[PDB]
Structures are given as C-alpha cells and as structure tokens.
Short mmCIF file of N, CA and C (backbone and C1' of nucleotides) in Angstrom, two decimals:
data_model
loop_
_atom_site.label_atom_id
_atom_site.label_comp_id
_atom_site.label_asym_id
_atom_site.label_seq_id
_atom_site.Cartn_x
_atom_site.Cartn_y
_atom_site.Cartn_z
N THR A 1 -9.96 4.24 -10.90
CA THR A 1 -9.67 2.81 -10.97
C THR A 1 -8.27 2.54 -10.41
N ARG A 2 -8.16 1.62 -9.46
CA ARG A 2 -6.87 1.33 -8.86
C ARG A 2 -5.96 0.65 -9.88
N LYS A 3 -4.65 0.80 -9.67
CA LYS A 3 -3.64 0.41 -10.64
C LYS A 3 -2.64 -0.53 -9.99
N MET A 4 -2.36 -1.65 -10.66
CA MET A 4 -1.42 -2.62 -10.13
C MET A 4 0.00 -2.05 -10.14
N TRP A 5 0.76 -2.40 -9.10
CA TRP A 5 2.15 -1.96 -9.02
C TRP A 5 2.99 -2.72 -10.04
N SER A 6 3.69 -1.98 -10.90
CA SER A 6 4.56 -2.60 -11.88
C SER A 6 5.84 -3.11 -11.21
N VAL A 7 6.58 -3.95 -11.93
CA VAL A 7 7.83 -4.47 -11.39
C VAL A 7 8.87 -3.36 -11.27
N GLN A 8 8.81 -2.36 -12.15
CA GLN A 8 9.70 -1.21 -12.01
C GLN A 8 9.32 -0.36 -10.81
N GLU A 9 8.02 -0.12 -10.62
CA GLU A 9 7.56 0.61 -9.45
C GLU A 9 7.94 -0.12 -8.17
N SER A 10 7.84 -1.45 -8.17
CA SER A 10 8.21 -2.23 -6.99
C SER A 10 9.70 -2.13 -6.72
N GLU A 11 10.52 -2.25 -7.77
CA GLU A 11 11.97 -2.19 -7.60
C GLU A 11 12.42 -0.82 -7.09
N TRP A 12 11.74 0.25 -7.50
CA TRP A 12 12.05 1.57 -6.96
C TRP A 12 11.88 1.59 -5.45
N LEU A 13 10.85 0.91 -4.94
CA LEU A 13 10.58 0.93 -3.50
C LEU A 13 11.64 0.17 -2.72
N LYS A 14 12.16 -0.93 -3.28
CA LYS A 14 13.22 -1.67 -2.59
C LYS A 14 14.49 -0.83 -2.50
N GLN A 15 14.92 -0.25 -3.62
CA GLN A 15 16.12 0.58 -3.61
C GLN A 15 15.93 1.82 -2.73
N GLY A 16 14.70 2.34 -2.66
CA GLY A 16 14.44 3.45 -1.76
C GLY A 16 14.59 3.07 -0.30
N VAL A 17 14.10 1.89 0.07
CA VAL A 17 14.28 1.42 1.44
C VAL A 17 15.75 1.16 1.73
N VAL A 18 16.49 0.67 0.74
CA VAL A 18 17.92 0.43 0.93
C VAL A 18 18.67 1.75 1.09
N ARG A 19 18.35 2.74 0.25
CA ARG A 19 19.09 4.00 0.26
C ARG A 19 18.74 4.86 1.47
N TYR A 20 17.50 4.81 1.95
CA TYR A 20 17.04 5.74 2.97
C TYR A 20 16.42 5.10 4.21
N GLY A 21 16.21 3.79 4.22
CA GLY A 21 15.65 3.13 5.37
C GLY A 21 14.13 3.04 5.32
N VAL A 22 13.60 2.06 6.04
CA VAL A 22 12.16 1.88 6.12
C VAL A 22 11.54 3.02 6.92
N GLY A 23 10.29 3.34 6.62
CA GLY A 23 9.59 4.42 7.26
C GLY A 23 9.80 5.78 6.64
N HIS A 24 10.84 5.95 5.82
CA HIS A 24 11.10 7.22 5.14
C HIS A 24 10.37 7.26 3.80
N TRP A 25 9.04 7.17 3.89
CA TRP A 25 8.23 7.00 2.68
C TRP A 25 8.22 8.26 1.82
N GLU A 26 8.09 9.43 2.44
CA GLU A 26 8.08 10.66 1.65
C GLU A 26 9.46 10.97 1.07
N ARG A 27 10.53 10.56 1.76
CA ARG A 27 11.86 10.73 1.20
C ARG A 27 12.09 9.79 0.02
N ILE A 28 11.58 8.56 0.12
CA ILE A 28 11.72 7.61 -0.98
C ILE A 28 10.89 8.04 -2.18
N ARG A 29 9.74 8.67 -1.94
CA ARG A 29 8.87 9.08 -3.05
C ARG A 29 9.52 10.18 -3.88
N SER A 30 10.26 11.08 -3.23
CA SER A 30 10.92 12.17 -3.95
C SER A 30 12.17 11.71 -4.68
N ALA A 31 12.75 10.57 -4.30
CA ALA A 31 13.97 10.09 -4.92
C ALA A 31 13.72 9.33 -6.22
N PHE A 32 12.49 8.93 -6.50
CA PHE A 32 12.14 8.19 -7.69
C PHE A 32 10.92 8.82 -8.35
N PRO A 33 10.80 8.71 -9.68
CA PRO A 33 9.66 9.34 -10.38
C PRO A 33 8.37 8.53 -10.25
N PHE A 34 7.79 8.57 -9.06
CA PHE A 34 6.54 7.86 -8.78
C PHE A 34 5.37 8.69 -9.30
N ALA A 35 4.72 8.21 -10.36
CA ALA A 35 3.58 8.89 -10.95
C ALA A 35 2.30 8.27 -10.41
N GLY A 36 1.54 9.05 -9.64
CA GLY A 36 0.28 8.58 -9.11
C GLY A 36 0.38 7.71 -7.88
N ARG A 37 1.44 7.88 -7.09
CA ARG A 37 1.62 7.13 -5.85
C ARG A 37 1.98 8.09 -4.73
N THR A 38 1.28 7.98 -3.61
CA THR A 38 1.57 8.78 -2.43
C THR A 38 2.47 8.00 -1.48
N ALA A 39 2.99 8.70 -0.47
CA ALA A 39 3.83 8.05 0.52
C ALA A 39 3.07 6.97 1.28
N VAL A 40 1.76 7.15 1.46
CA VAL A 40 0.95 6.12 2.10
C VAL A 40 0.83 4.90 1.20
N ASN A 41 0.66 5.12 -0.11
CA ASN A 41 0.67 4.01 -1.05
C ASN A 41 1.98 3.24 -0.97
N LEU A 42 3.10 3.95 -0.84
CA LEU A 42 4.40 3.29 -0.71
C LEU A 42 4.47 2.48 0.57
N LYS A 43 3.93 3.02 1.67
CA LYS A 43 3.94 2.28 2.93
C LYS A 43 3.07 1.03 2.85
N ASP A 44 1.91 1.14 2.21
CA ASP A 44 1.03 -0.02 2.05
C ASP A 44 1.65 -1.05 1.12
N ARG A 45 2.28 -0.60 0.03
CA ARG A 45 2.88 -1.53 -0.92
C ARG A 45 4.02 -2.31 -0.28
N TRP A 46 4.79 -1.65 0.59
CA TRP A 46 5.90 -2.34 1.25
C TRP A 46 5.39 -3.45 2.16
N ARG A 47 4.37 -3.15 2.97
CA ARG A 47 3.76 -4.19 3.79
C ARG A 47 3.25 -5.34 2.93
N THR A 48 2.65 -5.02 1.78
CA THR A 48 2.26 -6.06 0.83
C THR A 48 3.47 -6.84 0.34
N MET A 49 4.61 -6.17 0.17
CA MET A 49 5.78 -6.82 -0.40
C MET A 49 6.46 -7.75 0.59
N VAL A 50 6.49 -7.39 1.88
CA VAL A 50 7.12 -8.26 2.86
C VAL A 50 6.27 -9.50 3.14
N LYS A 51 4.95 -9.42 2.95
CA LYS A 51 4.12 -10.62 3.10
C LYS A 51 4.41 -11.61 1.99
N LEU A 52 4.37 -11.15 0.74
CA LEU A 52 4.78 -11.98 -0.39
C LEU A 52 6.28 -12.22 -0.41
N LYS A 53 7.04 -11.57 0.47
CA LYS A 53 8.48 -11.74 0.60
C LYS A 53 9.20 -11.38 -0.70
N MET A 54 9.40 -10.09 -0.93
CA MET A 54 10.10 -9.62 -2.12
C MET A 54 11.25 -8.68 -1.76
"O5'" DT B 1 4.38 14.81 5.61
"C5'" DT B 1 5.55 14.70 6.41
"C4'" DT B 1 5.48 13.47 7.30
"C3'" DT B 1 5.15 12.17 6.56
"O3'" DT B 1 6.26 11.28 6.61
"C1'" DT B 1 3.88 12.40 8.58
P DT B 2 6.22 9.88 5.82
"O5'" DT B 2 5.92 8.81 6.96
"C5'" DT B 2 6.80 8.71 8.07
"C4'" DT B 2 6.23 7.80 9.15
"C3'" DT B 2 5.93 6.37 8.71
"O3'" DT B 2 6.32 5.47 9.74
"C1'" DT B 2 3.98 7.34 9.61
P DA B 3 6.30 3.88 9.49
"O5'" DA B 3 5.23 3.36 10.55
"C5'" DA B 3 5.40 3.64 11.93
"C4'" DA B 3 4.28 3.03 12.76
"C3'" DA B 3 3.98 1.57 12.43
"O3'" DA B 3 3.64 0.88 13.62
"C1'" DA B 3 2.10 2.95 11.88
P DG B 4 3.60 -0.73 13.62
"O5'" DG B 4 2.04 -1.06 13.57
"C5'" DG B 4 1.18 -0.49 14.54
"C4'" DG B 4 -0.27 -0.61 14.11
"C3'" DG B 4 -0.66 -1.96 13.50
"O3'" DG B 4 -1.89 -2.38 14.05
"C1'" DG B 4 -1.36 -0.23 12.11
P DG B 5 -2.26 -3.94 14.16
"O5'" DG B 5 -3.86 -3.95 14.13
"C5'" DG B 5 -4.58 -3.00 14.90
"C4'" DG B 5 -5.70 -2.37 14.07
"C3'" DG B 5 -6.63 -3.37 13.38
"O3'" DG B 5 -7.97 -3.12 13.76
"C1'" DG B 5 -5.92 -1.68 11.87
P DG B 6 -9.16 -4.05 13.19
"O5'" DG B 6 -9.71 -3.23 11.93
"C5'" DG B 6 -10.28 -1.94 12.13
"C4'" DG B 6 -10.71 -1.33 10.81
"C3'" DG B 6 -11.70 -2.18 10.00
"O3'" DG B 6 -12.81 -1.39 9.60
"C1'" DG B 6 -9.87 -1.53 8.65
P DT B 7 -14.00 -2.03 8.73
"O5'" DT B 7 -13.67 -1.57 7.24
"C5'" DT B 7 -13.48 -0.18 6.96
"C4'" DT B 7 -13.34 0.07 5.47
"C3'" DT B 7 -14.37 -0.65 4.59
"O3'" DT B 7 -14.89 0.27 3.63
"C1'" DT B 7 -12.18 -1.14 3.84
P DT B 8 -16.05 -0.19 2.62
"O5'" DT B 8 -15.26 -0.52 1.27
"C5'" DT B 8 -14.55 0.51 0.60
"C4'" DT B 8 -13.86 -0.03 -0.64
"C3'" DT B 8 -14.76 -0.78 -1.62
"O3'" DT B 8 -14.35 -0.51 -2.95
"C1'" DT B 8 -13.00 -2.17 -0.97
P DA B 9 -15.37 0.14 -4.00
"O5'" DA B 9 -14.65 -0.06 -5.41
"C5'" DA B 9 -13.25 0.13 -5.53
"C4'" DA B 9 -12.58 -1.03 -6.25
"C3'" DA B 9 -13.38 -1.66 -7.40
"O3'" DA B 9 -12.47 -2.15 -8.40
"C1'" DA B 9 -12.95 -3.29 -5.80
P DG B 10 -12.09 -1.25 -9.69
"O5'" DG B 10 -11.18 -2.22 -10.57
"C5'" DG B 10 -9.82 -2.43 -10.19
"C4'" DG B 10 -9.49 -3.91 -10.15
"C3'" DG B 10 -9.96 -4.70 -11.38
"O3'" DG B 10 -8.95 -5.62 -11.78
"C1'" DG B 10 -10.70 -5.73 -9.44
P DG B 11 -7.86 -5.20 -12.88
"O5'" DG B 11 -6.84 -6.44 -12.89
"C5'" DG B 11 -5.95 -6.64 -11.79
"C4'" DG B 11 -6.05 -8.05 -11.24
"C3'" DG B 11 -5.96 -9.17 -12.28
"O3'" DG B 11 -5.30 -10.28 -11.71
"C1'" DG B 11 -7.97 -9.37 -11.12
P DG B 12 -3.92 -10.81 -12.33
"O5'" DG B 12 -3.71 -12.23 -11.61
"C5'" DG B 12 -3.64 -12.30 -10.19
"C4'" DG B 12 -4.33 -13.55 -9.67
"C3'" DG B 12 -4.10 -14.81 -10.50
"O3'" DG B 12 -3.95 -15.94 -9.64
"C1'" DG B 12 -6.42 -14.36 -10.37
"O5'" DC C 1 -20.47 -14.29 -9.41
"C5'" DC C 1 -20.14 -14.19 -8.03
"C4'" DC C 1 -19.30 -15.38 -7.59
"C3'" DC C 1 -18.74 -15.28 -6.19
"O3'" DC C 1 -18.47 -16.57 -5.67
"C1'" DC C 1 -16.98 -15.07 -7.76
P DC C 2 -18.47 -16.82 -4.09
"O5'" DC C 2 -17.12 -16.13 -3.59
"C5'" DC C 2 -15.86 -16.68 -3.96
"C4'" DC C 2 -14.72 -15.74 -3.61
"C3'" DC C 2 -14.88 -14.98 -2.28
"O3'" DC C 2 -13.63 -14.95 -1.61
"C1'" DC C 2 -14.45 -13.47 -4.01
P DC C 3 -13.36 -15.87 -0.33
"O5'" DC C 3 -11.77 -15.85 -0.17
"C5'" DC C 3 -10.96 -16.55 -1.11
"C4'" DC C 3 -9.87 -15.65 -1.68
"C3'" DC C 3 -8.95 -14.98 -0.65
"O3'" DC C 3 -7.61 -15.03 -1.12
"C1'" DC C 3 -9.92 -13.34 -2.04
P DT C 4 -6.39 -14.91 -0.09
"O5'" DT C 4 -5.65 -13.57 -0.55
"C5'" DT C 4 -5.30 -13.39 -1.91
"C4'" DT C 4 -5.19 -11.91 -2.26
"C3'" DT C 4 -4.33 -11.09 -1.30
"O3'" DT C 4 -3.52 -10.19 -2.04
"C1'" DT C 4 -6.43 -10.09 -1.52
P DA C 5 -1.96 -10.03 -1.71
"O5'" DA C 5 -1.47 -8.91 -2.75
"C5'" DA C 5 -1.95 -8.93 -4.09
"C4'" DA C 5 -2.54 -7.58 -4.47
"C3'" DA C 5 -1.68 -6.37 -4.09
"O3'" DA C 5 -1.77 -5.39 -5.12
"C1'" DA C 5 -3.80 -6.21 -3.03
P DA C 6 -0.84 -4.08 -5.07
"O5'" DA C 6 -1.89 -2.88 -4.93
"C5'" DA C 6 -2.80 -2.61 -5.99
"C4'" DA C 6 -3.95 -1.74 -5.52
"C3'" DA C 6 -3.55 -0.34 -5.05
"O3'" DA C 6 -4.50 0.61 -5.52
"C1'" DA C 6 -4.73 -1.45 -3.33
P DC C 7 -4.08 2.15 -5.72
"O5'" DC C 7 -5.20 2.96 -4.92
"C5'" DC C 7 -5.05 3.19 -3.53
"C4'" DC C 7 -6.30 2.78 -2.78
"C3'" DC C 7 -6.63 3.66 -1.58
"O3'" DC C 7 -7.45 4.74 -1.99
"C1'" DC C 7 -6.83 1.34 -1.01
P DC C 8 -7.47 6.10 -1.14
"O5'" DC C 8 -8.15 5.68 0.24
"C5'" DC C 8 -9.53 5.31 0.28
"C4'" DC C 8 -9.98 5.04 1.70
"C3'" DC C 8 -9.87 6.23 2.65
"O3'" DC C 8 -11.04 6.31 3.45
"C1'" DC C 8 -8.69 4.40 3.55
P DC C 9 -11.41 7.66 4.23
"O5'" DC C 9 -11.05 7.32 5.76
"C5'" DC C 9 -11.67 6.22 6.40
"C4'" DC C 9 -11.14 6.04 7.81
"C3'" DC C 9 -10.91 7.34 8.59
"O3'" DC C 9 -11.39 7.19 9.92
"C1'" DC C 9 -8.92 6.07 8.57
P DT C 10 -11.61 8.48 10.85
"O5'" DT C 10 -10.28 8.55 11.74
"C5'" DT C 10 -9.98 7.49 12.63
"C4'" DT C 10 -8.58 7.65 13.21
"C3'" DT C 10 -8.21 9.07 13.66
"O3'" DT C 10 -7.60 9.01 14.94
"C1'" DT C 10 -6.53 8.20 12.30
P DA C 11 -8.23 9.79 16.19
"O5'" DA C 11 -7.43 9.19 17.43
"C5'" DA C 11 -7.31 7.78 17.58
"C4'" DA C 11 -5.85 7.38 17.75
"C3'" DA C 11 -5.05 8.26 18.71
"O3'" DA C 11 -4.22 7.46 19.53
"C1'" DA C 11 -3.99 8.22 16.59
P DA C 12 -3.55 8.08 20.85
"O5'" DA C 12 -2.13 8.60 20.34
"C5'" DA C 12 -1.18 7.69 19.80
"C4'" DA C 12 0.06 8.41 19.33
"C3'" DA C 12 0.49 9.58 20.23
"O3'" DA C 12 1.90 9.52 20.45
"C1'" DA C 12 0.30 10.30 17.99
#
DNA sequence: TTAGGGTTAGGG
DNA sequence: CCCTAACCCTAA
C-alpha cells in the first residue's frame, strides 16, 4: 500500500536539495533517515513538490 | 544512477 | 468516483 509523504519527510527533501543540489537523490537519501523511500521516490516527490510549489 | 514520460491506486 | 500523487519503465 502506497504511503503519503509526511511533512517531515518533505522537509528532509528540501534541506537535502539545499545541502547537496538537485539531482543528487542517492546522496540526499543517505543524509536523512528515509524509511521506505528510494532515490527514485525522492526524485518523483520533488517533481510533485515543485508543481504544488513547496 | 538520474531524467522524463507513462502507470496506477487511494485519498480528497 | 476519479483525479492526482505515488508509483513504474528505461534510455543514456
């Protein structure tokens, strides 16, 4: 069953993009305790986030 | 391993 | 429901 991204999970992705740049999905995943999220999930979530503008 | 188009299932 | 966010597919 798919799982909605929490606000904490979302905030981790913003700080990861700030600290390491966009496209560095596997580097951002190792910098935060992402449980059950792959680097592709992070890439998809970011595209989702820029559409909703977050 | 990531980018970008495509797929799907669950929540608004 | 059914739209869209969370998924998948794959070239390079």
